[PDB]
């Protein structure tokens, strides 16, 4: 409700530049050996527009 991005990780991330859910974070699979990237294609322009722009309109 203010941040233009969300982290879809299991324990940690690295990248953070998206929308509400259109951001592509990283995930150091809390219970894994490798770190993969999150899907930053979730064009939640509504979540984002309503997240950052929704509050500070």
């Amino acid at each position: 409700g203010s941040q233009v991005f969300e982290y879809a990780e299991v324990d940690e991330i690295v990248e953070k530049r998206g929308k509400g859910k259109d951001v592509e974070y990283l995930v150091r699979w809390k219970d894994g050996g490798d770190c993969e990237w999150v899907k930053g294609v979730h064009v939640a322009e509504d979540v984002a527009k309503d997240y950052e722009d929704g509050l500070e309109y």
Partner: peptide
């Protein structure tokens, strides 16, 4: 479910 990355939530993408 998805081995590797995760999803914040239902993630609304139009």
């Amino acid at each position: 479910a998805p081995p590797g990355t995760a999803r914040r939530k239902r993630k609304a993408d139009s």
